[PDB]
């Protein structure tokens, strides 16, 4: 089971603070591109009630 992470810059989560000097605000923004996929779904069993 693969967690595929993508970033145009670097590899991990991209979290940045920035300042708006027109409004006197710090923004903190986070982004990430993610998907999750089995290579072999047969390799997992769910337990059901």
């Amino acid at each position: 089971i693969h967690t595929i992470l993508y970033a145009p810059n670097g590899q991990d989560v991209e979290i940045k603070d920035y300042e708006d000097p027109i409004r006197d605000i710090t923004g903190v923004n986070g982004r990430l591109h993610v998907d999750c996929q089995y290579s072999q779904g047969r390799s997992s069993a769910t337990v059901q009630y």
Partner: protein, 49 residues
């Protein structure tokens, strides 16, 4: 340059408004002032001054 003005009271996180320096000019001309005189070579010699 334009005269000194005053800042304005502003809400927190609100856009700071533009009131930049504005300019004008004073034109100069420059008029030619002239003055002249002539002295005869005979009197350039003869005068006591």
């Amino acid at each position: 340059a334009s005269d000194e003005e005053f800042a304005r009271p502003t809400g927190q996180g609100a856009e700071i408004r533009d009131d930049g320096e504005t300019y004008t000019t004073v034109a100069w001309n420059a008029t030619k002032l002239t003055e002249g005189s002539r002295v005869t070579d005979e009197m350039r010699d003869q005068a006591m001054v």
